[model samples]
Target: STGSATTTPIDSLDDAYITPVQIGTPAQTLNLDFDTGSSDLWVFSSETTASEVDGQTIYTPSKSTTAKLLSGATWSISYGDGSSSSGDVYTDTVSVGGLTVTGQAVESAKKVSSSFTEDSTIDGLLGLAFSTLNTVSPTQQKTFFDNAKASLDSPVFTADLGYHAPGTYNFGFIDTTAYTGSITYTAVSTKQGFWEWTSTGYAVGSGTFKSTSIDGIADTGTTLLYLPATVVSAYWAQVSGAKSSSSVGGYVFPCSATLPSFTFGVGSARIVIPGDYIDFGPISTGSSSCFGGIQSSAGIGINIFGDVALKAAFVVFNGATTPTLGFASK
Candidate 1:
């Protein structure tokens, strides 16, 4: 069995990619962020406080006949951006595309950060990371993919993200037509509970490729590409007026500046991110300074190949016994 879904970029900056998820018996369809960095299929629900709820849709588990409370079970999660959410757990029928899983753990949010409240378009998150990363307590639970993998044609899923348009997420199979050339495979470190892998090196524009090991995770949840300080600095230096802004919390440059393309290695294959993609839109309305899509991961501790980099390649998360990551140019 296999499934497919469409994820649409919420804004011009591609801040978040949202996909429709069917939860509960009758299917409470809510737009959720399919995050690869974290594991826990949580949602804004009836249990959420009114003060924390904005215009986002909520999942009413009480309305589903198939919903069963996981008594004594609870969950809480914090993101790298400092946002957090906590809630009770429920087992219900959950579906994505045409793929359905019975007794799927669905976390219902009781408390959420203001940042989440502000992002009204995002109802919640559907984590795709390994179950080891799940935040459920008492008894840990499996991800939707984990439960469905056994019956799937293959234990794999693929991400094809778009710049400003909608993209596709295919489960249980790989769509050869979605990518070009051959896929470059690399070992993954599940010990970190992420799709962590090492990039061979990187190059700026027409510059020569630097041979080095840059370790990072491919996170669809994050908005920007974060690399070592040296790498980020090198890319930004090619821009005429690029500068790190403490006030803005990242590298920003004049909107008029021409940007340089960035290239990274996946085994022997090279994926190039267009310069236009690096020029993230203006920091503020009508501002001449634009935020950069690539930033230093110095403070982040670990490097992150987020949407900025993923948008340039077709990523495959293989869930085999010896898990591996695959990348192909699209």
Candidate 2:
């Protein structure tokens, strides 16, 4: 059955939370974020100063019987949001969920920001989004997926960020029981880490919007659903009596009374994003109202369906089966 809650997007890197990977004969759980935008599984260590390592989970190598550190190799990562962390390199037996994968690569950061130190949930991030744009490169090349692919059950991995409480995210292996029929597949283009494509157009509220013949990309890294200005304006116009509410940011109407529905087609696969996803509140400057599901990204690029889009369907990143992506519903 489809998971409760509609689909959403993974707008920013910060939203991508990591789970713990337990390793060794006597397993120890180390929680980290899984980032496809970058490669590397980094965690904090006990050697870090109290202030630097605050809010961050530290893995004590001395405590683990199977821990091994990369001699003299230290690393640091700075994200698009200006958050940064620094630590050293190490190797250990790592396990996610209940799957035990040995010889997993890891980073132990000594110094971290307040944001990183604040959250006491998972220790660090386990980046599984993409591998090419990882922060740790040169000396360390392959990503955890690249190294552990052979050991996985299907050689294919699916990330299900099911509905967790606010400020909480959970990842789970794709339950094949969620799918209806054959999974629709798409070829992964050799472009940047962003999955770019052109949308044929959109059907908003039972009406087709202009510029229906345009290209776009599906980026999990982006947080909000950013669409073209012309498309946004036209879309709002179709909603009867729907006015642009500056208080809410984008076009807001009495959604409590009734909601609108829209569909975005990619080839034969039709992704249905409910209106509740578009109804949002202000999160930035310029009195810019956020749409329930779709919003404007200052004319950035094509429409980017963030975590909201992800929540609606089951996304399969089948790097193991082939260098392509598969889409289905839960």
Candidate 3:
């Protein structure tokens, strides 16, 4: 039987999804952020500085019978939000969804940026992008998915995210019953260590679908969707009273503002983002101002289809030679 595992979201921190992974001989479980934008499997551990470590679960290599240090091997990584992590390496048995990957390179963090430490919900990151992008220096490491692909029944994984609801990430095969309509598959480009692709175009409300292509990465780690600044401005303009704010951040509107539905295209297929989803919660608990889910990808140079957009549909990250992304309505 081809190994398979399904994971559910653990917490509600801006819609980010986490999966439980087992490492080492006695099984040290970690709640990891499954990121398609990065390719490193590093975790908070005993190697991390004591002061910087928050109330996070750390992996103790010394306590694990199967953990082995990859002497001299190290890894350092930075996030789009300027967050980062650096660490030494350890090889051990790692398993997810009943799939066991032996001798997998698991980076043990010695240092992590405030952005990561401040967010206590996350312990480590499971990089699902290509292995070529693995950040381990001196000797690059292979991701869990990379090692499991050869043995998977179909070398494909499906992401089923929800809005304030528990979702699952399936391995090796696609569940036809998970999504409605046919999955529209699009070719992927992976030059920048991400599951990058171009949307055929998009539309606001009932407007005509634009034919312009927007290149973006399918990132589950990020909370909101980011696009070109002008595109973001134009989209926000449709919502009355919505204005760009430097202090409040992004575009903010009255909490009761009536919003039009946003649509994103995948080849000939279009996925509609509901008006309710566009309102990314209030600025503060009792504030009348609210932030938008679609913001600018300015300075970043690439659009990010984060959970805000991803949760609207079923996403398939195919691990085949011709890597492609398939999307369908949930």
Candidate 4:
């Protein structure tokens, strides 16, 4: 019989969470994060030295009868946050819920940073978020979706975030039943390889800023909203004690009191970020005060609606059609 199981990837050290999946077998389990920025499956391996494998969850290939390594391939990934790792490539017969896919492209890293190594609960990341940005060669690779597509009740995958869990990320078949109706999709811009769109403007506590028009990229890998300096500063002016800090590179405001709620318009869609995320802690240099939900990117080409913003809504990228992005509720 098919049953649901919990899968988790390391986010932080203390309180960990899981991405629920319906698996059929009780094979060896490895924890992983579902990343939307890239399409790849990677896990920490036993071959890595103990010192290099600090907070990471290492998977013992010997535990799985179906696990296999692709002999001669390697990969290295660097995030915008300056985190990086390198690993050898392999092929593994992976299974999630009751679905099994043979020879899926997998990576086992040998060198990882201390930040990644310290998380004991999360071993690796599962790229169910997208299948187009693979680093592996076309002849010798397969994605989780490539295999699960046939078994999934629907062709779409949906992600849901935990309300209180800061970095909680979830993935799987998109259940339209949980949403309002059919997902609304937008054309995907090929320029930066990100799902992007233009913003009409922003409003803070009902005060709208009409100075400059903005465009933003929806990135699941990024953590916070990166906005223009002018917009960020303008919005913070309304808050009595709000201040900017250079040390942290963003705006910071005290966590106390009822902070103002802000929303940005994306064409007709108005995305509202809650007040709890409005005040960021002191991280910059100039002032200890930084706005929680928004940061100054100085109009650096693209504004990112990172993880914090993504958690507020359900998003979909339709690669099957002419590159486009879709948004809905879960």
Candidate 5:
């Protein structure tokens, strides 16, 4: 009735988190990126163009006796960063940790973009967003979470992400030991197929805590934390040499600059992100300037509380009668 999976950061920047997933009759294991911002369980497969695959693993549905082709079904997804993939569909037994679901829709990739091919560590994505966001044509398919929700002891899932360390995803139950203090629950909007919520306010370092509402999505799929330009600018202004660069792109500061911690509010809860987490990393191999972990969402069109923010707290995606999000310090 419950499932648990360990999620590990792919690289130093914590660009994405990958979890092991079992699919098919014999259980072909694949490392997939767990994405709350998207809703398509896609994987690199035997149907994919040979040239499109690099050093990544592929799922061969033909090898699974339980795999059934979904005739005329196709899917294509393009991310905000321009990474994309398209493929056909199949239904097969899928399992995460100890929980299993039969006839789970799995999209088999036929094509992938350069961004995907370059990242050999990622095989594909396991979307946890609402099924309404699925991109399958003819008849949209439900996500693994959606298909398995009815069987889960409780309609809920939790994400505990760590900075440059391994974390966990728990389904149907909350591990009270994984967090500290009482959890603060907040209303969430699923209309956009995202776990969108409004933050109470924010504070930089030990400065004044500004009380203002900021709308954003809790997106584990994204790497950095993006907020309104005013908020981003205010934070960077505290850094000695931080500036928005055109060629370098986004905000960057001296590698040795004294970084400040960031604190964001959820109801009455306050999650404080350490200064070290905001010092993303050097922009280039030997560059003296480093890119910031928090950037402006002006161009992105929407605020995103990505890994940079998520790693600071224990997040619960409650899918009960009235969907809500719970946060706690960890």
Candidate 6:
């Protein structure tokens, strides 16, 4: 029953990447976002009305001989970005890469917001977080990885996210050659079911390091790096013409502005993000305006070190004992 699986980015969205997920009896495969922020394996399914469905593929449990309804059970989920999904639950076989987990709880959405329906590439979300965060009503369910961990050689998974290139999510084992040098480890505080931790400090460009001690979560689903408003202001202070807007959201700057490197602490080690990476491409492509990659997490309550930050290094989400994060250069 033991096996290994690897899911590579099938397509990039200028934000979090997506990968194909195999599910059900006949094995209907759909592209889903491998998210570490929350727990819930949900998909746009036959339960959704035709008018509500857009470019995303739908999952129909009735077509699968192995699918069974989770009688008297339901699930509902909402993201910080305001996207939401709700539907009935079904138990079916779920597979990713080369690994397969039988009797997995797959949520079939009956309703979803435009933010999801419009984003056709993302057929659904595969939660990699702890099983405690599963949103099924009456009873929580384990994730595909959680179900397969017992058969795995190691209770660990690695996220080798990349910049402007394809990356991978490896299950059950860590490939030593994927990264260089020693991987620094940090303890994860998971009262919130996230890869939560407090960075030791940060430095603005070549400036001396300051003990900001930011407490945040590492979220693969989020697109940007977020910190407190005051911390965001300190970094923007180094930029020539950057400013924040309540209406425009986050800080915006002229496309031509020169930026500086942003560094943060992980355990006793420091991880730096280059100045070019600080500019989050263009606000809407073709448009001359640009958005800052690092923004204020003020209103969100919990700061998120999203793709922008995680892509800078190789991250290992270990579930062996106390959850820990191992980071290394790509």
lDDT per residue for candidate 6 within 1-330, as digits (tens), equals: 433344444344346688788888789999889899988999999999677799888899989999999998899999999999999999999988778888999999999988888887889999988889999989888987788888777887788777767778888887899988778898898899888988888888999999868899988898889998888899999987788966678898888888898888888788887887777756786966788999999889988988878887878888876788888876
lDDT: the better of candidates 5 and 6: 5
In candidate 1, residue 13 scores what lDDT?
A: 76
Candidate 1 lDDT for residue 268: 86
- Cα deviation at 292, candidate 1, in Å, is 0.3
lDDT of 3 by residue, 249-298 (tens): 78899888988888999999999988777777778889999889989999
| TM-score of every model versus the real structure | 0.99, 0.74, 0.95, 0.79, 0.99, 0.95
Each candidate structure's count of clashing pairs: 0, 55, 1, 33, 0, 0
Candidate 2 displacement at residue 323 in angstroms: 1.3
Stretches > 4 Å off in candidate 3: 1-13
Where does candidate 6 clash, by residue pair? none
TM accuracy, model 1: 0.99
TM-score of the candidate numbered 4? 0.79
Relative to the true structure, how large is the alpha-carbon lDDT of every model? Answer: 0.94, 0.57, 0.87, 0.59, 0.93, 0.85
For 214-320, candidate 5 gives per-residue lDDT tens digits of: 99999989999999999999999999989999898799999999899999999988999998889778998998999999999999989999999999999999888
On lDDT, the candidate that comes out on top is 1
Ranking by TM-score: 1, 5, 3, 6, 4, 2
Ranking by lDDT: 1, 5, 3, 6, 4, 2
Better of 2 and 6 by lDDT: 6
